[PDB]
Structure 1
Amino acid sequence: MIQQESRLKVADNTGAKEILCIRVLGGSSRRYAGIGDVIVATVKDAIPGGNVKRGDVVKAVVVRTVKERRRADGSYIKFDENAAVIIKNDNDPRGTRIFGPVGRELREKKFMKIVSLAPEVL
């Protein structure tokens, strides 16, 4: 249940720590973004000499949320913190290592390299 002007953490190697949501892609007047919906997002923090730089405009995906999400089985999920992953136009990550867990939704959105790089999918 994410929006504009929302700060998120990164789960990558890219050399960023934080990001900011600018849009939510998948239509027009889309208000919310869940676990598996692309965003377009800039950078508000960096590592010392990361590849990424503070002020970029990159494109990302959400893998975690703090708001709950149903599934077909009647189950739910709730992570603690809102996290995201930089991704390039072929829906591939920029990084090489993923931090922390993700959701099973990404296997069915066709975000699968991520799931291969995930340590713990839930």
Structure 2
Amino acid sequence: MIQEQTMLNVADNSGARRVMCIKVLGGSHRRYAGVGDIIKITIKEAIPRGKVKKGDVLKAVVVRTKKGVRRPDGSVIRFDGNACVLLNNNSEQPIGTRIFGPVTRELRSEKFMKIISLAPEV
């Protein structure tokens, strides 16, 4: 359950440390965000000379939720720590190159083909 005001981690090679979800994109009155939903975040903390900077607003996709994602057999892949991957605001095109932190098979939907390809595990 990633919703507004949720402080996510970052899981790519872009520069940020703590982001904060400010809007769950997708629909009216939409409560939370889940598996691979696109969300709008803001950057609260970064590395000094990196690409993104503090106080910037761009999109993201959730990858690892603390509540976890259900597989069709009744199994759950409960992670430990909320994390996301920064995206370009104007297109799919993830700004990262080194996606750390193993992601889920539930992102394999052809618009995130670059995400799974750069991912270490699962």
The answer to whether TM tops 0.5 is yes
Task: For 1:119, give the aligned amino acid.
Answer: P
Structure 2 unpaired stretches of 5+: none
For the residue of structure 1 that corresponds to 2:60, the secondary structure is: strand
Q: 1:92 to 1:5 in 2, by over 3 A?
A: same
Map 1:49-64 onto structure 2 (within 5 A): 49-64=49-64
Runs of 4+ in 1 over 2 A off after TM superposition: none
- Identity, % of aligned positions: 66
Map 1:1-122 onto structure 2 (within 5 A): 1-88=1-88, 89-108=90-109, 110-121=111-122
Cα deviation, residue 106, structure 1? 0.6
Q: TM-score, normalised by structure 1?
A: 0.93
Q: Is the 8 A contact 1:36 1:109 kept in 2?
A: no
Structure 1 unpaired stretches of 5+: none
Q: Is the 8 A contact 2:23 2:41 kept in 1?
A: yes
Q: TM-score, normalised by structure 2?
A: 0.93
| Deviation per residue, 1:52-104 (Å, 9 max, x gap) | 11000010000000003222122211000000000123312101110110111
How large is the RMSD of aligned CA atoms in angstroms?
1.2
For the residue of structure 1 that corresponds to 2:71, the secondary structure is: coil
- How many residues align? The count is 121
CA distance, structure 2, for counterparts of residue 112 and residue 73 of structure 1: 24
